[PDB]
Amino acid sequence: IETVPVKLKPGMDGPKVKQWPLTEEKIKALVEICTEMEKEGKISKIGPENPYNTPVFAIKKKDSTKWRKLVDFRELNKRTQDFWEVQLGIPHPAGLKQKKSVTVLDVGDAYFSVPLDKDFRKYTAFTIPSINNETPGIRYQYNVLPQGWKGSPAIFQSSMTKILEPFRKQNPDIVIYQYMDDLYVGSDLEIGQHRTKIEELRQHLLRWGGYELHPDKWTVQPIVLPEKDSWTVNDIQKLVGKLNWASQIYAGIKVRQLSKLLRGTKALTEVVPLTEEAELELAENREILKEPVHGVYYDPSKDLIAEIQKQGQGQWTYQIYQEPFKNLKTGKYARMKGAHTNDVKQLTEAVQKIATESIVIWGKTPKFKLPIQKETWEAWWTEYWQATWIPEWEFVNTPPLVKLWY
Amino acid sequence: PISPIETVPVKLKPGMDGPKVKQWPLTEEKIKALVEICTEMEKEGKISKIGPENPYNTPVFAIKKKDSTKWRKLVDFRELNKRTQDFWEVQLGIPHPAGLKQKKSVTVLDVSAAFYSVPLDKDFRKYTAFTIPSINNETPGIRYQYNVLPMGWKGSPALLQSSMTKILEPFRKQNPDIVIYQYMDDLYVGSDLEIGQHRTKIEELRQHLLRWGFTTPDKKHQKEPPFLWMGYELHPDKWTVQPIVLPEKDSWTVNDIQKLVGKLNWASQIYAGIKVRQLSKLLRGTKALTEVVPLTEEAELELAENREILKEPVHGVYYDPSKDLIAEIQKQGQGQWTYQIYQEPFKNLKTGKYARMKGAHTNDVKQLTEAVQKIATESIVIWGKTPKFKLPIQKETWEAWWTEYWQATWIPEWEFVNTPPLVKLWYQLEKEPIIGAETFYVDGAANRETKLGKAGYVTDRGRQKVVPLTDTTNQKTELQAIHLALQDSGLEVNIVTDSQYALGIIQAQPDKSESELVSQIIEQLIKKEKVYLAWVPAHKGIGGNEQVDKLVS
DNA sequence: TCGCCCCCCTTCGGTGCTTTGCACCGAAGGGGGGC
Ligand SMILES: Nc1nc2c(ncn2[C@H]2C[C@H](O)[C@@H](COP(=O)(O)OP(=O)(O)OP(=O)(O)O)O2)c(=O)[nH]1
Ligand SMILES: [Mg+2]
Numbered sequence: 004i005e006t007v008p009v010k011l012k013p014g015m016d017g018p019k020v021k022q023w024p025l026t027e028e029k030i031k032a033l034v035e036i037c038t039e040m041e042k043e044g045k046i047s048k049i050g051p052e053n054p055y056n057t058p059v060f061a062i063k064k065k066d067s068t069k070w071r072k073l074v075d076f077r078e079l080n081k082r083t084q085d086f087w088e089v090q091l092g093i094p095h096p097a098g099l100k101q102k103k104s105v106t107v108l109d110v111g112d113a114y115f116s117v118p119l120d121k122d123f124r125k126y127t128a129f130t131i132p133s134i135n136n137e138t139p140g141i142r143y144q145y146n147v148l149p150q151g152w153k154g155s156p157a158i159f160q161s162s163m164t165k166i167l168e169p170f171r172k173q174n175p176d177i178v179i180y181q182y183m184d185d186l187y188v189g190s191d192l193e194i195g196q197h198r199t200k201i202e203e204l205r206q207h208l209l210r211w212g213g214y215e216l217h218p219d220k221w222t223v224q225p226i227v228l229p230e231k232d233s234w235t236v237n238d239i240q241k242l243v244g245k246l247n248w249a250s251q252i253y254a255g256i257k258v259r260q261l262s263k264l265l266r267g268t269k270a271l272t273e274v275v276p277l278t279e280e281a282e283l284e285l286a287e288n289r290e291i292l293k294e295p296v297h298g299v300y301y302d303p304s305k306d307l308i309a310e311i312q313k314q315g316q317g318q319w320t321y322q323i324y325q326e327p328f329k330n331l332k333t334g335k336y337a338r339m340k341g342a343h344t345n346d347v348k349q350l351t352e353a354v355q356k357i358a359t360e361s362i363v364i365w366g367k368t369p370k371f372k373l374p375i376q377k378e379t380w381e382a383w384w385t386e387y388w389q390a391t392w393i394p395e396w397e398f399v400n401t402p403p404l405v406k407l408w409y
Numbered sequence: 410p411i412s413p414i415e416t417v418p419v420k421l422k423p424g425m426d427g428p429k430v431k432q433w434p435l436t437e438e439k440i441k442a443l444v445e446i447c448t449e450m451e452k453e454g455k456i457s458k459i460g461p462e463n464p465y466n467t468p469v470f471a472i473k474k475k476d477s478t479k480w481r482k483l484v485d486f487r488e489l490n491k492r493t494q495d496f497w498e499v500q501l502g503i504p505h506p507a508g509l510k511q512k513k514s515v516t517v518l519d520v521s522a523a524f525y526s527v528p529l530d531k532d533f534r535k536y537t538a539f540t541i542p543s544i545n546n547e548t549p550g551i552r553y554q555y556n557v558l559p560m561g562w563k564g565s566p567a568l569l570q571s572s573m574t575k576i577l578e579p580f581r582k583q584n585p586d587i588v589i590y591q592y593m594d595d596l597y598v599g600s601d602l603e604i605g606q607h608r609t610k611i612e613e614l615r616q617h618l619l620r621w622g623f624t625t626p627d628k629k630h631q632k633e634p635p636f637l638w639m640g641y642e643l644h645p646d647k648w649t650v651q652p653i654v655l656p657e658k659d660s661w662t663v664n665d666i667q668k669l670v671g672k673l674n675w676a677s678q679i680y681a682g683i684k685v686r687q688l689s690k691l692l693r694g695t696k697a698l699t700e701v702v703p704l705t706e707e708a709e710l711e712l713a714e715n716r717e718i719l720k721e722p723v724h725g726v727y728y729d730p731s732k733d734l735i736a737e738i739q740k741q742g743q744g745q746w747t748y749q750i751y752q753e754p755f756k757n758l759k760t761g762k763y764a765r766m767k768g769a770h771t772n773d774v775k776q777l778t779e780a781v782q783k784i785a786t787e788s789i790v791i792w793g794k795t796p797k798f799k800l801p802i803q804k805e806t807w808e809a810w811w812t813e814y815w816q817a818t819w820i821p822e823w824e825f826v827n828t829p830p831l832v833k834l835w836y837q838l839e840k841e842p843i844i845g846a847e848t849f850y851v852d853g854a855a856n857r858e859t860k861l862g863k864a865g866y867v868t869d870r871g872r873q874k875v876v877p878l879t880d881t882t883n884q885k886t887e888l889q890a891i892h893l894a895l896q897d898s899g900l901e902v903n904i905v906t907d908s909q910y911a912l913g914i915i916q917a918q919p920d921k922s923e924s925e926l927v928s929q930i931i932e933q934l935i936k937k938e939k940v941y942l943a944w945v946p947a948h949k950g951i952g953g954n955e956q957v958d959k960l961v962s
Numbered sequence: 963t964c965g966c967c968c969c970c971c972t973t974c975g976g977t978g979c980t981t982t983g984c985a986c987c988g989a990a991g992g993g994g995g996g997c
Contacts, residue, residue, distance in 0.1 A: 027793030
């Protein structure tokens with residue numbers, strides 16, 4: 004079979020990202036994986052006259068204790084031509100978020116049966132590091148559609164359709180969505196029944212070459228106001244600053260007749276009784292937060308953005324928007340492993356879960372605004388990553404003024 | 410001998426052509442040193458004569474070697490390098506002796522003139538044109554081009570390292586029981602074979618290198634400890650750095666001090682407790698490398714302390730993979746940290762220091778977190794794993810930090826160690842307002858055109874204050890308003906501001922700052938007993954904030 | 963009168979914020995060391 008001509012976007016050059024340090028066990032796995040991939044002709048050894056580079060590392064899920072090579076092609080993907088522009092993108096189905104169980108399959112190995120444009124291969128180079136820099140790095144480049152390159156699902160699009168046709172034929176109410184190297188497969192069958200047809204899809208796929216999600220439990224968490232029977236000056240100042248912030252999100256919310264319950268230079272702990280005209284304003288404002296916002300619709304031509312705040316005791320709130328204060332979704336992510344000690348593990352898992360929800364709901368991952376120092380994140384995050392994709396992110400230091408989402 | 414290895418194709422950057430730079434004058438002794446090398450380079454096939462068809466040129470010179478009697482040839486390829494393609498460099502880092510394991514048999518070999526044994530892409534050679542002068546007018550220069558990797562060309566190190574990796578790879582695969590540290594042309598070869606078999610494997614390696622044209626002269630063939638390697642001395646049981654001679658001066662220039670600080674950083678990899686903060690402060694605000702800078706008293710003390718440390722003999726030990734790595738950190742003051750990495754007590758593998766100021770405002774807990782991160786990354790590079798930590802911070806202190814700080818933070822498995830001074834939070838803001846304590850409503854405003862501002866407050870006890878401010882900013886006036894509330898309140902106070910900025914800084918509990926105003930606020934916070942700090946939106950008519958915002962007008 | 967690599971300390975300039983300075987960050991200057 005012949006290659007599809009691929010180009011970068013005009014005026015852009017290939018990626019030039021340095022390899023970061025890797026533990027002994029990750030270096031050994033990459034050496035084993037790449038040595039076999041080189042034997043099978045999927046990759047070729049290259050030298051330093053190829054000026055491009057992309058970081059490589061490895062992940063190991065614990066319900067499949069084999070290492071998985073992960074190349075961080077985020078930079079290369081940003082510079083690669085769009086395939087929506089040249090008639091090759093994968094349409095997202097609105098029915099997947101309706102299914103009660105969704106299983107994720109790693110189908111990245113199917114790409115290795117299609118060759119890559121000879122003139123594009125140089126942009127895929129990566130470098131295996133060496134413990135205590137005993138040797139120079141060892142470099143490879145792909146000869147086939149790489150795992151994690153956004154052009155691989157697009158070029159393989161024609162083929163995966165033909166491979167899947169009989170399964171979707173025989174199961175018209177199971178919905179399958181391809182995102183990168185992943186198939187998201189959802190249905191409404193009982194928990195062990197659904198798992199069985201997953202194993203049937205797996206065997207049909209083998210004919211040629213994670214854990215159950217539950218979207219009907221992705222509860223949205225709205226802005227709530229506290230309920231007490233006695234209210235301090237500080238309580239009502241906390242209440243007013245929160246509503247003033249929410250007046251950029253919701254419509255017709257006032258603080259005029261809570262603001263001057265606080266008339267005068269008052270002590271922060273003096274209890275102020277609520278006027279009937281204040282309880283009128285508050286129970287009103289709580290019902291606006293009860294049911295959400297009118298005029299907020301997804302736009303596929305714009306990027307998704309996610310903000311996360313640490314709340315404590317294992318809780319993490321998050322919002323997904325495209326335009327400021329027009330949240331498509333607000334939520335709260337909860338603890339898992341039970342020690343609840345490791346903030347970086349919790350944030351890394353929160354990012355995978357939030358990004359997974361975006362894939363199922365809208366078909367792509369958001370750019371994350373992460374409440375963590377860049378160097379703290381980079382010291383530890385790969386130790387907890389379990390997805391074959393990696394979202395875009397940036398690092399912010401925003402102190403809380405209100406705790407709007409708690 | 411030139412390697413029969415295949416040339417690596419190399420190109421100029423798109424649109425560019427070759428360099429054209431006239432040659433300059435050199436001494437009589439350097440021209441005959443080069444002519445000896447050059448006519449010998451021509452007879453060994455390393456260079457070839459060219460003439461006027463090739464229009465490119467590049468100047469040449471020579472420097473002498475640590476080997477006192479040999480000369481090193483260099484061509485000033487600064488212009489050709491600019492027009493040469495980029496490379497992805499394969500040297501990712503520098504091997505460290507603390508990453509070595511104990512070996513029964515050890516050898517250090519060096520390949521001679523390794524660059525000149527690696528052929529250069531034939532289509533590229535014409536861009537390496539140069540000219541050898543021979544005094545001034547006695548002749549015009551003879552013209553050559555390189556057939557091999559030139560010293561001074563941007564791509565020569567990468568193409569030597571890559572070629573060396575290819576040549577060695579057969580022998581590494583055949584002898585996995587033999588560790589070969591490969592740095593440029595320097596080969597450390599360790600094994601657990603008895604000296605007899607080991608020397609068989611060395612001659613076998615040497616013969617394999619020579620078939621590919623890499624000579625290994627016995628002059629650079631070490632077979633007995635102590636081995637000289639990467640600036641260290643390798644003994645069977647331990648390693649030392651080669652001697653570090655510090656400059657000693659009556660008068661110090663900026664450039665002298667820069668040299669001194671560099672020597673001390675290098676020493677800090679094995680000499681515990683080195684400090685460079687006061688010496689480095691002398692470089693701040695200077696404007697010439699030859700400007701004389703008098704040492705402050707603090708820098709003299711620091712220098713003397715370092716000098717005491719460096720006359721004590723030290724050594725590192727080698728890595729035992731069957732034992733844990735342990736990393737212990739001490740606080741030295743003024744944002745300075747020192748650490749040791751060991752496996753058995755009082756036998757350091759190496760040491761180090763962390764002294765970077767990250768951010769305008771920070772505290773000891775953050776900086777300790779940063780030291781831990783620097784150490785974790787260094788341990789991954791050298792040993793492929795992170796160490797267990799021993800830290801002078803109590804579990805209560807850390808738990809108080811990661812529950813009241815809004816950013817995700819973490820430290821891996823660690824054990825408290827009581828080595829004062831301990832790392833501690835210097836104050837904590839109350840989560841709830843304080844009963845019976847005064848309540849200050851603070852505010853400050855400045856005018857952008859003016860340099861002019863006011864800071865002041867009002868109080869639930871009837872107190873008020875306003876002070877004029879000159880050459881200030883909007884953010885400064887807000888910090889000033891908080892400064893006065895802390896100044897005029899008792900040991901317990903409640904404060905309300907409308908500065909997200911100020912609340913942002915102070916809520917992160919900083920204990921140090923590059924700003925003297927923020928430093929003053931930190932001093933006042935440490936002296937207090939309880940402080941609750943609250944925010945309200947500005948210009949919304951809120952009682953307290955209202956009256957003070959009126960007042961600051 | 964040269965090349966490539968890692969490290970540290972200082973300085974500078976680009977970016978984004980519901981900003982008007984400020985805080986962050988990468989690159990470049992200096993130094994150490996390696997070949
Ligand atoms: N461009 C350049 N390369 C150097 C320099 N110092 C060392 N090297 C490079 C070139 C050398 O081929 C290589 C190793 O140098 P060595 O000092 O170990 O030996 P060299 O090849 O110079 O001659 P020799 O092995 O003693 O016969 O690394 C330098 O100052 N400038
Ligand atoms: Mg040599």
